[PDB]
Amino acid sequence: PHMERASLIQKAKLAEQAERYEDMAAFMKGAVEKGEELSCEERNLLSVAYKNVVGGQRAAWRVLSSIEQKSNEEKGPEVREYREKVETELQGVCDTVLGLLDSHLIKEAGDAESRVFYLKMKGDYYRYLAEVATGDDKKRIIDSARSAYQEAMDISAAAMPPTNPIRLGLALNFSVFHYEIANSPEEAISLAKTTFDEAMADLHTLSEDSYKDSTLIMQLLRDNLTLWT
Template identity: 65%
Template sequence: MCKFASLLVATDPDEGNPVNGSDRLNENQLCCQRKNTIISHIKPGAVMTSSKEDLVQRAKLAEQAERYDDMADAMKAVTEMDPNLSNEERNLLSVAYKNVVGARRSSWRVVSSIEQKSGADQQKSDTDQKKVCMLKEYRQTIEKELQDICDNVLDLLDRHLIAKSESAESKVFYMKMKGDYFRYLAEVATSEKKDEAMKNSQESYQQAVDISKNEMQPTHPIRLGLALNFSVFYYEILNSPEEACNLAKTAFEEAIAELDQLNEDSYKDSTLIMQLLRDNLTLWTSDTQAEAEDPEENPGN
């Protein structure tokens, strides 16, 4: 499968299959620059008794150490303590869970690929059969971890963040995040659960789009990131390349038209996401043309 870029806060480490390593935009590139301050004297297991300020510093330290589970725990505690997050705190929360869930998504794709290849062999020995069973059990273990992470994030969004968000920017950010995590559930779910996750993801993205069009400039990095991830949803989850291309093309062209009005503070973030939109659009267009030229190789399309 071709890889393409998607965004999570800025980015989905893999929005190519969303996160198949195609989200080549590092979340740190899109989020605010944070000071490289090393925090000392932080006791293990102090999350539940720490102040909000201590928890935020702990999250920053965990990010520097690339201990994203610890980072997520700290920011979860911050959110439950006070859901009115600053931009920096909001980005810390997003980066933490993005990396936590991203590791499981990547693992799930690897194991699923091995499982599919092993299952393709019609004549299996007893050893092969055991391997197939082991692969299935391991995939299901990873799925359970991924689903639990997504459920935790969605619970934070529904119980604390969305209802308490006071600005259009934060509302769009959280609704986009909700769409992302339902999309991750849809990637691994089957039958009715998959349909439900797809429906919830699309509704969340659309609500965010409706708000962003009325309240945010086309060049705003959060609005652009939303368009990027929503277009990936259409392409990757709904298998609707035409809709994905239309969404990406419209977002890119609207931003280009107002590029001269772009705020200097967000110029780098916005142009990075615009480049991802254009890259995806180029890839998707070429894939669609290739399928049209050789329909026998794609009988289902």
């Protein structure tokens, strides 16, 4: 009557190959709603699906806001109306992801790496909502993003090595949150520097494959530090 979990996962993999990320997100939402935990592979299919969907909406929103700002600094209400439509759709996708995280995926116990992964996702989608938010609502959204990232930070520090790619990615995104969203550039630079140095000190212990994965994210930290300093 319904579709098997394995078939939803297989079609999400096909949808990724066919670059049909809206379909991929729908298959992964269906697989999450089966109630079973996600594997490391399956967690990435969920994140890839929604990151691509919301990424396209974020990009469209920036284009429309850039046109709108230039139109003020061409005297029609259509630019504001259409930017508001894209904004509302983006918010709906973020609310869907955050709903999945809270109603199923995030648990009070279980695999630390998966919990960190999901709490980082929670911080990320509240950060995407903050990118388009204004006023007192923006203040609430920023607090929710910092809470999720901070909880993930606390768990990752006690449960994962400093070279873990998910720990590295979390710290990279939380430093971007500090720099771009919370207006805390000093904390952003401090965090990125600290994360890179702690990981560099431990790289000598890694296998060839682990070193490739960790150094891939360390290059993103290196890149932002260059940009910010």
